[model samples]
Target: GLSDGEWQQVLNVWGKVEADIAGHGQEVLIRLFTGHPETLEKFDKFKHLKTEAEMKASEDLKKHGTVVLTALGGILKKKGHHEAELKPLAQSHATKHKIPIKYLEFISDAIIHVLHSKHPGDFGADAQGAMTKALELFRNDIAAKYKELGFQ
Candidate 1:
């Protein structure tokens, strides 16, 4: 298990990356936490498990995050961005690992709450813009971190 400091590093790195790409949006943190095994597991075991709201939220989170990451990969590849090298990493991690989409959606919602509670604000002018930036910054690294945990 990661020490408290190590866990903080994980959150900090992901937060910076998400802020850089998605611009201080909770959606980025939502995606990062949903895609993380430990966090996801906790979400799954939450008291509100298997509810309709939770299910929908999980799907929305995964779909949005996947679509954004895929588009980001395409843009980076087109622009010859070095991070494009991580595209395959993201893609491979994105394969549906038999996880219930609903669970993912619920986790996303939970993550949103965690993020907002931690960094309360309007975030910025454009919610989508902020989310997009956050997604672009940490999408790949978050996926890689999950891989380290033997998610895929």
Candidate 2:
């Protein structure tokens, strides 16, 4: 569990970024695919996108990216009380989408990269730590659900 102060930092920075969810979400996804192109296969919407340039121009990517950001924001808003919320997301990604647990780490890394790149000043050490811990918890929650669903 994070301290109240930590929650403040995480939520505060989240507030700053939530408004531009679509843009930042696209950046995060792009970063994820850039680092791990294999994960692109999981996205049915833009799986046919051959290159990074095409991906960047994709309206489908924008929509899905916005959804990803919205989901992350929803989890963050819970401030560590997101068990019920996590189950559906985890289930869908694990069972329906066939997302690997390892991909979650890459997503987290891409999120961190996007946030840091966008808010170098606001997302400082304490806020970064808080957000990292929050994402770690979210990842664990998803992984637990995935395991329960027999996703290895």
Candidate 3:
């Protein structure tokens, strides 16, 4: 967990990402699927795309990317109080979507990659620590929910 000051730094840095969440989110998903092709296989809407260019050009991917980032922004805005949202979200992913929990961690990595790629100047040590810690908490909550649901 981030200290109070560090958490605020996360918010400050996140403000920049949120400014272009759709763009950044698309990049994050692209990075995720590119780095781990198996993850792409899980997305029926995206699995048929044969190449990076096709993935980048897909409007469906772009729209879903925005939705992904918007959901993330919703939790971040809650300042760690994410149970109400995460419970159902985890259930949906675990049971309905049957998404592997590891994908959440991979998404975190993709997020960091996008953050660094987009804001090399702004992503200093403080921002990195804050974001990383915050993301860990996100992963933890989701994993915990998955376990409670006996999905794993």
Candidate 4:
């Protein structure tokens, strides 16, 4: 739904950050858990990390963070046509994993925070709007899948 230029901006910004997916993921996850410590309980492997420092240093966090970025990477490849790709993820997180929507929001928030912090000049208003809309659509797609399955 973004203009061609806006779409390119998304690609450019992500292209830069994916270079250090490990580092970006770590920062995103650290920023996330640091702000929402309660969410740590969802990751049984990471629950042992009692403090922000511990969470930052956990290998599981880094791997999972990379996974998050990788998913976003796929969406970029798809040019925002990610609903099909995200449906299973939504279903799994909603029913099997039983993750709440707020946690999903945390992922987006973390990405935004990390992107802005890591590449301040790369993201302009139009690009930011496009990315924001893309994230919104992704979130809605996930939520819709959860509802479709009657997962509540």
Assess every candidate by TM-score. 0.28, 0.95, 0.96, 0.90
Tens-digit per-residue lDDT, 21-112, candidate 2: 88998899899988898998887777898899998999889898898889888888999899888889999988888999999999998888
Q: Give the TM-score of candidate 1.
A: 0.28
> Residue-wise lDDT of candidate 3 within 32-117, one digit each (tens)?
99999999988888989899999899888889999998898888877798889778888899998888889999999999989999
Q: Go through the candidates in order and give the C-alpha RMSD of each one to the true structure.
A: 13.3, 1.1, 1.0, 1.6
* Model 1 pairs whose backbones collide: 18-134, 21-133, 21-134, 22-130, 22-133, 22-134, 57-105, 58-104, 58-105, 58-106
Count clashing residue pairs per candidate.
10, 0, 0, 0
Best by TM-score: 3
lDDT of each: 0.44, 0.88, 0.88, 0.81
Model 1: per-residue Cα lDDT over 45-85, one tens digit each: 33243443463455454454555444544443333243555
Q: What's the alpha carbon RMSD for model 1?
A: 13.3
- lDDT tens string, model 4, 47-80? 8888877877788889988897898789777876
Angstrom error at residue 91, model 2: 0.8
Query: Model 3: runs farther than 4 Å from truth?
Result: none
Please give the distance, in angstroms, between residue 122's alpha carbon in candidate 3 and its true position after superposition.
1.8
